[PDB]
Design a protein around this ligand. Structure first.
Ligand SMILES: *[C@@H]1O[C@H](CO)[C@@H](O)[C@H](O)[C@H]1NC(C)=O
Ligand SMILES: [Ca+2]
Ligand SMILES: [Ca+2]
Ligand SMILES: [Ca+2]
Lengths: 298, 299, 65
């Protein structure tokens, strides 16, 4: 009791002010949001069914393009990586800063969200990719037009990079809960989609396998967690949508924690949401960059 | 310094007054945080948007109601799919479909067959970007079932003077005939008919070596000209080369407009030239090729 | 245990709680604010001080026990 009141009183008074700071910080952002951010992306002439076709048509620079995978749907914007491994890659998911919120409900993950591309210092074309999820419906159709490979790239906060390649990748339509399938793995990042978390064994590992899983968001449970507990779900509020099992070995759509390592007292729900790829940086680490690209097989 | 034990009962319940108060704020702050999040779910606003009105070409669209110039999706009758184009619309109700454009040299026009066939550059709603639509598209637009098309060609020196050259019955064949350019007659224009030929005095058949009517398109990786060598390769571009040109709008963009025989390691006249309006050594500052149904070119 | 000593055993948890709670909100707001970068005219540049939160937590553990 002696020095006890001293301590507690010092903290409660301390926090009070951090609350005062935080409150201020939010007000400043509310004011900046009275207006939007903007881009001016003049559209390239060349176009195709998806990036690979474009690059075979002469589209050799990495920038935003318009593609019409099929005459039914209307042509839409996408970013094309024409430099990485012989180019022709259609980016369907990208993380590089914390610019976009990835903890969205089922619909935003169905339709898509984020910024496909941004302008590059005095330029009429958006040559840099933003952070975005192309959209489950679109991703579904793309991986179904024919054999599709998938390239996952990531980087830690120390500048290191590792890839995860998947010879075959498909995503069923909505009515089939966008079920995922992958195979022919090869890489350096570790096979977290098919095998599961490396630091695990038996059922503990096998239950962190994404391959074959259904897609779920914090407002639509399709995870491998069968029960009645209205809380034990894999995707909680602000949680990103992914192909959750019980619950994961990797999650490219997790919350973008700054710095890398994070812990249970920082996590909104104590769970380890965040740009994780266990097989590489471990359990409570969040990548600085994380992207997903597809391309016809051959 | 260690006060009265009676000060305990007091301050020991005071920390509780600033504790629950803290939780209170935290509850409102979180509510405010939520509102912030709701304001941060949108994407940045893209200035460049595309109009919904579609149609066979910029004229069809114009007639359908299109009033302003910008990007549109057209789909000629025989095309397999729709493609984006820049439509120019005047207060008269005319829908020009632009396929060539120069204005700053920001785009390199030294491309190969495929690229010239598919198209390169960028399309801007404000029609302020250099591009080449693509021979296949240009072919499709100009050969729609029984619809005579016309070609207008506007130039602009680095001094504000702009000229034009109109061609009746413009047309471009399929890849099979190497996108051959053909027109019935030079519908006039102060730019002057450079597609008919131009005597430079160099040879006794300059007029024969620089005529473009009937010529097939050529690129460095696909020579279809009327010269022993490679026009497209020498001037480093893509065009309906003969042997080689009197009118060449896909030339190298020479800043300032005035270039010389000392601008290249061979002395080639590879700039944006149009012999009848300027010397073969005056590369234009702006260029623009557009087409529209002939039955629209002023009665 | 006299009433006053039980009131403190209470505040000690309440505060170690509010600490973890703020520590979270701190990271939350940080992440949410950054996410506005992709939607709003600009994102409020900042950097959260997790250290002070970690230092008070230990400053508590020690005194609680
Ligand atoms: C699986 O996880 C549980 C805790 O959830 C643990 O008790 C068990 O030992 C783990 N199984 C393994 C990998 O030994
Ligand atoms: Ca969210
Ligand atoms: Ca469940
Ligand atoms: Ca030749």
């Amino acid at each position: 009791i002696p020095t006890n009141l001293r301590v507690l009183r010092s903290i409660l008074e301390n926090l009070r002010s951090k609350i005062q700071k935080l409150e201020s910080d939010v007000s400043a952002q509310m004011e900046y949001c009275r207006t939007p951010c903007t881009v001016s992306c003049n559209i390239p002439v060349v176009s195709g069914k998806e990036c690979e076709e474009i690059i075979r048509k002469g589209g050799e620079t990495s920038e935003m393009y318009l593609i019409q995978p099929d005459s039914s749907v209307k042509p839409y914007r996408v970013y094309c990586d024409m430099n990485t491994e012989n180019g022709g890659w259609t980016v369907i998911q990208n993380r590089q800063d914390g610019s976009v919120d990835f903890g969205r409900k089922w619909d935003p993950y169905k339709q898509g969200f984020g910024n496909v591309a941004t302008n590059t210092d005095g330029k009429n074309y958006c040559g840099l990719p933003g952070e975005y999820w192309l959209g489950n419906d679109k991703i579904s159709q793309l991986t179904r037009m024919g054999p599709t490979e998938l390239l996952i790239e990531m980087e830690d906060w120390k500048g290191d990079k590792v890839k995860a390649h998947y010879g075959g990748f498909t995503v069923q339509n909505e009515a089939n809960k966008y079920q995922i399938s992958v195979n022919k793995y090869r890489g350096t990042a570790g096979n977290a989609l098919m095998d599961g978390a490396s630091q695990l064994m038996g059922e503990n590992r096998t239950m962190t396998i994404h391959n074959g899983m259904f897609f779920s968001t914090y407002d639509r449970d399709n995870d491998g967690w069968l029960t009645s507990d209205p809380r034990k779900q894999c995707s909680k509020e602000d949680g990103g949508g992914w192909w959750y099992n019980r619950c994961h070995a990797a999650n490219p759509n997790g919350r973008y924690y700054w710095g890398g390592q994070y812990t249970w007292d920082m996590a909104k729900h104590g769970t380890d949401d965040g740009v994780v790829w266990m097989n590489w940086k471990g359990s409570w680490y969040s990548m600085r960059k994380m992207s997903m690209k597809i391309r016809p097989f051959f | 310094y260690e006060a009265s034990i009676l000060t305990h009962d007091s301050s020991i319940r005071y920390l509780q007054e600033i504790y629950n108060s803290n939780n209170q704020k935290i509850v409102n702050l979180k509510e405010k945080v939520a509102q912030l999040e709701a304001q941060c779910q949108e994407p940045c606003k893209d200035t460049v948007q595309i109009h919904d009105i579609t149609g066979k070409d910029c004229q069809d669209i114009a007639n359908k109601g299109a009033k302003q110039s910008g990007l549109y999706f057209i789909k000629p009758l025989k095309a397999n799919q729709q493609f984006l184009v820049y439509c120019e619309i005047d207060g008269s109700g005319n829908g020009w479909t632009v396929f060539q454009k120069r204005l700053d040299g920001s785009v390199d026009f030294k491309k190969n067959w495929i690229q010239y066939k598919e198209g390169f550059g960028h399309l801007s709603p404000t029609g302020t970007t250099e591009f080449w639509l693509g021979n296949e598209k240009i072919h499709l637009i100009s050969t729609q079932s029984a619809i005579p098309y016309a070609l207008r060609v506007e130039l602009e020196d680095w001094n504000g003077r702009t000229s034009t050259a109109d061609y009746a019955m413009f047309k471009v064949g399929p890849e099979a005939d190497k996108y051959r350019l053909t027109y019935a007659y030079f519908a006039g224009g102060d730019a002057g008919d450079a597609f008919d030929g131009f005597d430079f005095g160099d040879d006794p058949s300059d007029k024969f070596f620089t005529s473009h009517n009937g010529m097939q398109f050529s690129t460095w990786d696909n020579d279809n000209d009327k010269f022993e060598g490679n026009c497209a390769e020498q001037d480093g571009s893509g065009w309906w080369m003969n042997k080689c040109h009197a009118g060449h709008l896909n030339g190298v963009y020479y800043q300032g407009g005035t270039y010389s025989k000392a601008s290249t390691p061979n002395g080639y006249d590879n700039g944006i030239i149009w012999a009848t309006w300027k010397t073969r050594w005056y590369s234009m500052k702006k260029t623009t090729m557009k087409i529209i149904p002939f039955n629209r070119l002023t009665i | 245990v006299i009433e006053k000593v039980q009131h403190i055993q209470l505040l000690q948890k309440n505060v170690r709680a509010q600490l973890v709670d703020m520590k979270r909100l701190e990271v939350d707001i940080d992440i949410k604010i950054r996410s506005c970068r992709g939607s709003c005219s600009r994102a409020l540049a900042r950097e959260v001080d997790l250290k002070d939160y970690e230092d008070q937590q230990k400053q508590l553990e020690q005194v609680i026990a």
